[PDB]
Amino acid sequence: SVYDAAAQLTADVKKDLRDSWKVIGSDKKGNGVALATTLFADNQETIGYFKRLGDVSQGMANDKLRGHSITLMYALQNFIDQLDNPDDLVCVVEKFAVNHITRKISAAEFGKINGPIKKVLASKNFGDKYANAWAKLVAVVQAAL
Amino acid sequence: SVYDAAAQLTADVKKDLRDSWKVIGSDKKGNGVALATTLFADNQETIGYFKRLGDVSQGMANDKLRGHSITLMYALQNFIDQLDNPDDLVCVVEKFAVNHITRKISAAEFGKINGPIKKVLASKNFGDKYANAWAKLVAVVQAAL
Ligand code: HEM
Ligand code: HEM
């Protein structure tokens, strides 16, 4: 279950998530847009899902993309803040899962975000250990999809 | 105009928003649920819009309501963090406006949140001065609906 996946996040994993977030989460606009644009660059097949945002190749200049990207980072902020209470983490994860289930995003497709996250982490010198920690957090959402 | 509304957020208004947020934003789960339940209690005619959350009278015990309420507080956190840059505040406000436009929520009904905000603030010893500051922020969202 989702609760199971959440309750598995160990102290070490939570430590790595918080340490890396202190950095990548410090510039939500810059890193949020980097995350989104990297997703579109490496997984062009996902562009169609974001038609509401207009021309995503416009990057930072696209106000709809910027608003979306900043907000995406607050969903992650939400997750990080709920790490010590699986019950709260689960209810917020399920909330965001619904947002994606309604758009027909499968657990497998949702996992496509791991590549971009790994790249954004690497830009700040956070290696594989950190990418693995984030993949575990993403897997909690996948358990709800 | 959302831009003219954003212009109403003067130095004094921004300070009052930040000062009060430091307190109410410290307990997102507790105050978020308080805000939502107050809205439902004082404006029963709005409960229909929240059909997805189930029995909202259950309050904190309702997992969907708790997830929704915590997330609502992160939307406010988002707004507060964008006060320095008008262009960024506008794009995030327009993003959330869409979430409500699709739910058929008008500017007038969105404004029904002012009562609950005033009550929650008052319980924390923040009077009319602060309630009015928050009404100006809510007015920016109203301009986009
Ligand atoms: C770290 C992972 C992710 C997080 C935290 C996340 C978060 C969000 C948030 C907060 C929204 C706005 C929800 C709303 O207001 O309706 C959203 C929308 C959306 N997401 Fe994600 N998302 C993630 C990954 C993905 C991936 C990998 C895909 C696609 C393969 C995806 C597809 C969508 C789509 C299509 C929308 C709707 C955009 C729109 O029309 O406004 N998301 N996401
Ligand atoms: C401070 C004011 C408010 C803020 C910041 C706010 C924020 C939010 C957020 C973040 C969501 C989730 C969007 C999504 O994922 O689709 C939401 C959903 C919603 N909001 Fe608000 N909201 C506010 C006031 C109101 C008011 C006053 C009403 C109604 C009179 C309203 C009606 C709704 C409805 C119907 C939903 C959909 C709930 C669901 O089915 O999940 N909101 N709001």
Swiss-Prot record, chains A, B:
Record-listed heme b binding positions:
100
Domain of life per record = Eukaryota
An annotated Gene Ontology molecular function: oxygen binding
Q: Which UniProt keywords apply?
A: Cytoplasm, Heme, Iron, Metal-binding, Oxygen transport, Transport
- Any one Gene Ontology cellular component term annotated for this protein: cytoplasm
Spell out the CDD domains in the cross-references: Mb-like
- UniProt cross-references to Gene3D superfamilies, sorted A to Z: Globins (1.10.490.10)
Q: Where is the Globin domain?
A: 8-145
Major location category of this protein: cytoplasm
User: Where in the cell is the protein located?
Assistant: Cytoplasm
One Pfam family hit: Globin
The UniProt entry, under InterPro entries, shows: Globin, Globin-like_OT, Globin-like_sf, Globin/Proto, Mb-like_M
* UniProt family annotation: Belongs to the globin family.
Oligomeric and partner information: Homodimer.
Checking PANTHER family in the record gives: BLR2807 PROTEIN, GEO09476P1
Question: What is the name attached to this protein's record?
Answer: Globin-1
